[PDB]
């Protein structure tokens, strides 16, 4: 019974571990986890927590590139909200459709 329950909880435990690692590597770049995740989603970069943790552990430069992209998207969104103008759009804030 404990084996079945722990098999169910293993996914949650490993997801929490990946989230903790992504945080660690994010505040190591001076960026918070919620902002990093939302700005990575806004860039249509659909990398799950496991892959993000793998990149954080073994690809420091790639993870720093991802953090820089997420941050840049964050200032782009903040500037768009401050300006409140339909015409001014950021470079990385453009949305691409399916093809």
């Amino acid at each position: 019974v404990k084996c079945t329950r722990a098999r169910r909880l293993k996914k949650r435990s490993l997801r929490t571990l990946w989230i903790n690692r992504i945080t660690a590597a994010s505040q190591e770049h001076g960026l918070k986890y919620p902002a990093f995740i939302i700005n990575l989603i806004k860039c249509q970069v659909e990398l799950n927590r496991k892959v993000l943790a793998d990149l954080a552990i073994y690809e420091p430069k790639t993870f720093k590139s991802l953090a820089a992209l997420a941050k840049r998207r964050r200032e782009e969104g903040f500037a768009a909200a401050l300006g409140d103008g339909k015409e001014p759009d950021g470079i990385f804030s453009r949305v691409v459709q399916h093809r």
Partner: protein
């Protein structure tokens, strides 16, 4: 990148000594980042079973600051086990008795309630003032930024800034101060 297995392991799981100034800083905000560093939640290689943990040296403990009236309201309760041996000491009295005790108890509280808490506490060094032994000073890697911005007093303000700040109101000449 192209290291041998043993040096790569040592570099990955090496211990780091951090410095933390405690002058005019809240114990909760200091000890929260302290607990983060002791657990190792700042490492992407972190795991509960692994022994990933770094040392933290907190200085200027005697000059700590409490927000609000916590100095007179916050209490610390202990019991010696013997009947009638239940003591409740105010935060001010506890700080006057032992300056280290405040931050020590805050870190102990925010550390996990597992058996590893004692192990990570043994890696914590707290000093009331800027008097750190050389053997520990030679281990420091970096100093973490203060979590709270210390406000300046009136005399600490520069005269050019004082003149730049406008006078909102004009006092009358007939009034006496």
């Amino acid at each position: 990148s192209s290291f041998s297995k043993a040096p790569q392991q040592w570099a990955t799981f090496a211990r780091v000594w951090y410095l933390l100034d405690g002058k005019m800083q809240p114990p909760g905000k200091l000890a929260a980042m302290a607990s983060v560093k002791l657990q190792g939640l700042h490492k992407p290689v972190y795991h509960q079973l692994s022994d990933c943990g770094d040392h933290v040296v907190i200085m200027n403990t005697r000059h700590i600051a409490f927000s609000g009236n916590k100095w007179e309201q916050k209490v610390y309760s202990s019991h010696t086990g013997y009947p009638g041996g239940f003591r409740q000491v105010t935060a001010a009295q506890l700080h006057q008795k032992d300056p280290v005790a405040i931050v020590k108890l805050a870190i102990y509280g925010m550390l996990p309630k597992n058996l590893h808490r004692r192990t990570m506490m043994q890696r914590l060094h707290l000093f009331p003032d800027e008097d750190i032994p050389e053997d520990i000073l030679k281990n420091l890697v970096e100093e973490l930024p203060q979590p709270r911005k210390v406000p300046r007093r009136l005399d600490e303000y520069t005269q050019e800034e004082i003149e730049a700040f406008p006078r909102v109101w004009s006092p009358p000449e007939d009034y006496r101060l």
